[PDB]
Amino acid sequence: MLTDPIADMLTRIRNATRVYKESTDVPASRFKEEILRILAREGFIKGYERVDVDGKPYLRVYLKYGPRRQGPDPRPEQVIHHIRRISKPGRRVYVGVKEIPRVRRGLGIAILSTSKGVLTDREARKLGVGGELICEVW
């Protein structure tokens, strides 16, 4: 039944990016869209569309990756080095404003739901609000 839709996707993304798969699906949701709509905005994904699989709504997340590499191991750098859910279902995280993280000194992003949207560390910050720290990526 899945306990958490969200970190499930992020996992999808994660496991995917690790073998470099071009794109990989994930059941559709108003919310995951919104999550991704930021994965795009900030350039972690190339993008996503409400692709179908057997009558069932999904999303193609088209994964961004580094350039090839020189020397031992032609391992492309990684557009998404590290993704991990924060506010888990078993333990809700609810940061006020002056409490939002500073992910890896700026380079990092921190999504999070809010009464005025689905903003980010700076977007919600500058906007001047607080909400459920969805997760951080960098």
Binding site: G90, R91, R92, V93, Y94
Partner: protein, 99 residues
Amino acid sequence: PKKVLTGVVVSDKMQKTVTVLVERQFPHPLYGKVIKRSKKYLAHDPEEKYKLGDVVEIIESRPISKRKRFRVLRLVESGRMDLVEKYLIRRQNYQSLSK
């Protein structure tokens, strides 16, 4: 402002008195995860109007008796025994713990 609470009535066996149970919720001081605890309040009801399974607003009030410092404000919905179901079940697993 005289604090007020909604909790379900959970016993009517008293003369002009009623047992009201009220779950609050809040986050654990170290573990955050919102946790749930509850307390019973001894409400006054001079009209003996409210019956079991009623969900009620309860107001901080002048002391009526040793345990009554609240009075029934107003109904919120009649038929909700399913909740008293729970409070009874809980109170019954106890009897199977002793020695």
